Amino acid sequence: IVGGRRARPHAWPFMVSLQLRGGHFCGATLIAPNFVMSAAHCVANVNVRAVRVVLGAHNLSRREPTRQVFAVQRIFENGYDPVNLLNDIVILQLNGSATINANVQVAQLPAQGRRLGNGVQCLAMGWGLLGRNRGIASVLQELNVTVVTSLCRRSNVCTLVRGRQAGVCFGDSGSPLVCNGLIHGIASFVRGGCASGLYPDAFAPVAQFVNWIDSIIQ
Numbered sequence: 549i550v551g552g553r554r555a556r557p558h559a560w561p562f563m564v565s566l567q568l569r570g571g572h573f574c575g576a577t578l579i580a581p582n583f584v585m586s587a588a589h590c591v592a593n594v595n596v597r598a599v600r601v602v603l604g605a606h607n608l609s610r611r612e613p614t615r616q617v618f619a620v621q622r623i624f625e626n627g628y629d630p631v632n633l634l635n636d637i638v639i640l641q642l643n644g645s646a647t648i649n650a651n652v653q654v655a656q657l658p659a660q661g662r663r664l665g666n667g668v669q670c671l672a673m674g675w676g677l678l679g680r681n682r683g684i685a686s687v688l689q690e691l692n693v694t695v696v697t698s699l700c701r702r703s704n705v706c707t708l709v710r711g712r713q714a715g716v717c718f719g720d721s722g723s724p725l726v727c728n729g730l731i732h733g734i735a736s737f738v739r740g741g742c743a744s745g746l747y748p749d750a751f752a753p754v755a756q757f758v759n760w761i762d763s764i765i766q
């Protein structure tokens with residue numbers, strides 16, 4: 549997240565950090581006790597058994613007894629196309645079920661086919677780079693964004709921060725876009741580099757996949 553702010557500790561208890569070699573590299577969302585939802589490009593070419601799924605985190609730079617750490621046991625995709633970044637969504641089956649407490653909870657999702665209009669106020673978040681060569685974020689970041697259709701495909705939900713250069717950046721892939729309490733997006737791609745002020749950020753449109761998601765998780 550470039551141009552955002554620290555989230556309050558555990559303000560988004562569904563927020564998930566995907567990790568390799570002990571380092572964060574993608575976000576995800578908890579959609580059931582034993583399932584997380586991320587971008588398909590995040591796990592396309594990784595050792596799935598080497599990934600660790602970290603729930604309940606806030607400062608990746610510390611030790612937090614609030615964390616619950618899981619492995620991945622099975623992958624579910626839905627026609628992902630890496631050339632054009634279509635259907636950029638995956639479901640991760642965990643090696644167990646999380647404990648729902650203050651700092652770990654299941655997110656709410658929209659109805660199948662729901663499509664957001666221009667100007668809807670949303671919130672992006674993640675542990676990705678802060679921009680300006682400040683490096684990767686330590687504490688979870690959040691950013692106020694607006695839904696836009698200009699320079700966006702109908703196969704995405706895109707967002708933009710009007711008037712300044714801010715947006716998602718490297719490491720935010722897979723993170724949720726929250727609009728009115730529901731998860732409508734999964735971070736998929738930027739254009740013109742991060743925080744360009746020229747192109748909106750593009751999210752996989754969760755609403756288009758809710759029937760498929762249910763069929764995985766009940």
Ligand SMILES: *[C@@H]1O[C@H](CO[C@@H]2O[C@@H](C)[C@@H](O)[C@@H](O)[C@@H]2O)[C@@H](O[C@@H]2O[C@H](CO)[C@@H](O)[C@H](O)[C@H]2NC(C)=O)[C@H](O)[C@H]1NC(C)=O
Pocket residue numbers: 600617618619643644
């Ligand atoms: C679910 O997975 C977690 C993650 O640990 C990794 O994946 C496991 C399959 C196993 O290979 C671990 O050793 C891997 O590091 C498991 O958490 C680990 O559990 C062991 C034994 O209790 C413990 O010594 C490690 O410190 C734990 N690692 C972390 C990062 O917490 C967990 O036990 C698995 N649960 C089930 C039911 O399989």
